[PDB]
Design a protein around this ligand. Structure first.
Ligand SMILES: [Cl-]
Lengths: 93, 97
């Protein structure tokens, strides 16, 4: 039915170092897209450092206890049966 | 006046044959810079009847490659330019079976 597309490009929300940080975006598609994240071409492994979640068309990566080591180019990949959509965001803590 | 800057463009991206590819990249610069997508020294032209499409706003560029074919694989260069300077960045698009 529809290839994935970003309604909102990935945007970072930072409070401070030591507090959680969120890279979030709005993605549409039919079938609904699968979202994957990669920091500096290295894929994000969910767990202690990162947490992935999605409320409807809102997809969000949470970086727990933000550190200077979390700085880098994060690439969001929305994939489905029809296509792929890529968009990136540079995080500088 | 403000010189242009490519915000964040992926280094490498991969897609399977026959699918649609979308690469959205944000940019800065006043006056609004000339967006130029190129591959192997050849400028990508947004052909309405073709497979390749480029959707440009005042702050965002989007590369569209419909029904991706093996030949489309390569090193794509996004290049902005205005009265006050220029910036370039590369995305290595890979094609798979
Ligand atoms: Cl990829």
């Amino acid at each position: 039915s529809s290839a994935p597309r970003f309604l909102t490009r990935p945007k970072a929300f930072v409070v401070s170092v030591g507090k959680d940080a969120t890279l979030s975006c709005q993605i549409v598609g039919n079938p609904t897209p699968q979202v994957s994240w990669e920091k500096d071409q290295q894929p994000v492994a969910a767990g202690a450092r990162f947490r992935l979640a999605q409320d409807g068309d809102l997809y969000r990566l949470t970086i727990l206890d933000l550190a200077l080591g979390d700085s880098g180019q994060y690439v969001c990949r929305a994939r489905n049966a029809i296509g792929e959509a890529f968009a990136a965001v540079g995080l500088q803590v | 006046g403000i010189p242009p800057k490519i915000e964040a463009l992926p280094s490498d991206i991969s897609i399977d044959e026959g699918k649609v590819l979308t690469v959205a990249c944000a940019f800065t610069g006043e006056p609004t810079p000339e967006v130029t997508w190129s591959c192997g020294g050849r400028k990508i032209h947004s052909q309405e009847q073709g497979r390749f499409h480029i959707e440009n706003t005042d702050d965002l560029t989007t590369l569209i490659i419909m029904d991706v074919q093996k030949q489309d694989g390569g090193l794509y260069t996004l290049s902005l330019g205005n009265e006050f300077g220029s910036d370039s960045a590369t995305v290595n698009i890979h094609i798979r079976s």
